Design a protein around this nucleic acid. Sequence first.
RNA 1: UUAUAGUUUUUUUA
RNA 2: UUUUAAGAACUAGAUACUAACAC
RNA 3: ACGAAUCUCUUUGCCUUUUGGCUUAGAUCAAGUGUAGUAUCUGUUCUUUUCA
RNA 4: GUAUGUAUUUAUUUU
Lengths: 338, 69, 48, 160, 48, 102
Amino acid sequence: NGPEITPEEATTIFSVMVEWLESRSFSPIPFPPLTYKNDTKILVLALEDLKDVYASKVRLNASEREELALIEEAYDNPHDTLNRIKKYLLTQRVFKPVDITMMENYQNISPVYSVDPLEKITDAYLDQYLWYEADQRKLFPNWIKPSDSEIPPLLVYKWTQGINNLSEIWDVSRGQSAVLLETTLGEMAEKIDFTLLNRLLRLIVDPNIADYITAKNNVVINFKDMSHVNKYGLIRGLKFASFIFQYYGLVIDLLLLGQERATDLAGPANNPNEFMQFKSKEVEKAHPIRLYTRYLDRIYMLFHFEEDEGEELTDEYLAENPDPNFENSIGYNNRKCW
Amino acid sequence: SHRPQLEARSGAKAAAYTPTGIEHARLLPGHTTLKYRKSWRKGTAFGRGYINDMTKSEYHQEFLHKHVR
Amino acid sequence: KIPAAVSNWKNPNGYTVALERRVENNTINDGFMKLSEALENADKKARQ
Amino acid sequence: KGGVWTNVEDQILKAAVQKYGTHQWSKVASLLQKKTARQSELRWNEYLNPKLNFTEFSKEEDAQLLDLARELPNQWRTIADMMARPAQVCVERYNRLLESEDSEDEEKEMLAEARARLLNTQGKKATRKIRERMLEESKRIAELQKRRELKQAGINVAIK
Amino acid sequence: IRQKKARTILQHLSEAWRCWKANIPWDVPGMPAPIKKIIERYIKSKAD
Amino acid sequence: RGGISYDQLAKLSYEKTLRNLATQTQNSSKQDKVQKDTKTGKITIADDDKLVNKLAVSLQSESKKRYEARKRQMQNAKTLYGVESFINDKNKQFNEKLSRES
RNA sequence: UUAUAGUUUUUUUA
RNA sequence: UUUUAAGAACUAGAUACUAACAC
RNA sequence: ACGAAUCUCUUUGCCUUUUGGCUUAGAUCAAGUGUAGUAUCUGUUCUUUUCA
RNA sequence: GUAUGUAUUUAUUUU
């Protein structure tokens, strides 16, 4: 059936990210240079990250032992390896297969990928390197937060404090309302589409590295006998498959906000806000949208409404979905706990 | 030495046998008698049966779109 | 006439077999062609 | 530890695949030493398996190539199948196509090992039977020439 | 003609099934069309 | 071309042993009742002790010549073809059945 | 290492 | 009527399979 | 001349010792140690015949 | 560490 997006949508999306960035005035990443000031540190980190998988183990299987070898040398010969990698990214486009085995919850299931050790070691270096250079250059604005500074329950907390202590929501004097959305993105990665990627990454990262990614996805997938090329969606077990993921969702976000309201949340790049901040109350009140927070999948939003605007919406909706039934309260859903 | 069977045991080979006399359980008399019948909102980027088959089905693809997840 | 079984998995007597008894049509959809070249157009506009 | 491929072990492989079939690899790395499942099957599917296409270009394959690989920024195994050509080779002959732009001992002992292994198909039970039966026949022969030598004494001892 | 032809066609049966597990599109190069129908029929049945 | 029905074949063999029988009789010219029992339902036929023995001997020699065609066929057939891999005898046998295929 | 030891999924820290 | 093994002596051990036998 | 028969060989037909199940591919697939029984891998040196 | 399997003829069967 061919590509789904249609070229129309494609162009619109790309342009979006563009005027964001130029407007955001962001400098793209260079490939890790041969002379790098920080470099072996970063590699310290990534390798400890692999090490930690095996910290606990006692029985080590074959691929494992292969690993610990590859590690131990990597400790020994940092300039060796760094050269080996920067080579690998500059060049190699084709990769060993990959292995899914699903692991059980006794209720649901989840895919567990396994990459292959060299590919891993490179990756982990590059994962680490991305996050560091990005957050160094303040790629992501506040409101994308499964982030550093806040462990999850604390995130809940400051999210409440956000809700409340912003100005005025509790004055019901007139009809005044405020409404939260709780959402998923459904499939999110599994529609991530390469040809789109390799461009959107031509934005923010050198054409090579990005190439290393887009060409880093497609693999055979061997589950035992069953095997198939992976032509389309996204394998998350790739060490860096976090980052781009966040990236892609940002694109979603600059839609749901649309430019301006985002420019509220970020403020200037010179003065990116903390989580919950603005300049005047009006900055909140220049728009109905007050909080927007997107955590992995789930999107969480807060609208502040007065009967004017809100009844102009229900003017739209109602106009197109009249229900003399008055049954629109049937399928509607809220909590079974409370 | 695993062989797929090609056959089944004729009742006759049984039939010639003499009886046993063991009494099993489920044969104890029961049901002993029968029965008979008689403004702002413009900001964002967008200006305004049963299919006999399985792994292409609608349900099944929902299901596996939940659980294996 | 029924062919004879050569089965990738079991080989229950050990018999050996010439490989090929053990062992695409379409192209892409031009939706691609349009996709990458449209991405391309907006691209070069933007960089300009 | 870092290895490369002798046509010795390569041949032992293609013999092994030519018996056990593809998807039993964990056996194919038994005969083959020095090597693993994923290693074996990696080189097999990516290189050795004859059903692959090894040949030159053509302008079908070429204009085809720059077509597809220009449309899809890098996805090689997809484009590979699109060419019905092996992965890294399409990659390679591609890069060349833009490079016109410019400005015997213990291996003989392992072969003794596998070459000896293939030739016994049964499993422990059947061999065990071969023995047991022959032992029965020795019993017969013995008991016979027992009776024969007893007939040469004329005393006739009946068989059980 | 039965015995050998039969059993061996069953070997085609199994081979067909454990194809359909592994997703093997299972085209045996040539083979009588109706029999191949039977195989498809049953393997649907066992499939569900 | 081709396969012969098990009918017409049995007829043809009937012809072959016709003409062979004819070389028996005629060649025997070249080199040169039914009783029933009223007592019991048994019937009694009288035949020459001749031509019964020609019969049996003919049969035996047929079994011979066929047996030997099959045997010499063993020898030649198993010595000739040298191509495909063979683990044991039955690989040669069966594998040559897969050659019989196409 | 003992009074055993094929099925009883064999093996991880705060 | 069948048949014909190159023959003899000297040599070390490497890779081996396994062992209700020794932490 | 050709009719008939025996043997020999080639071709075709018929396949003759010619793959006999299922379940999660049934699951799993390497890191040890001394000695000992038994299998077998190579070198060197010498000599090419018959009768009671 | 074991199931499992095998043989255990002594007391003379007529020439």
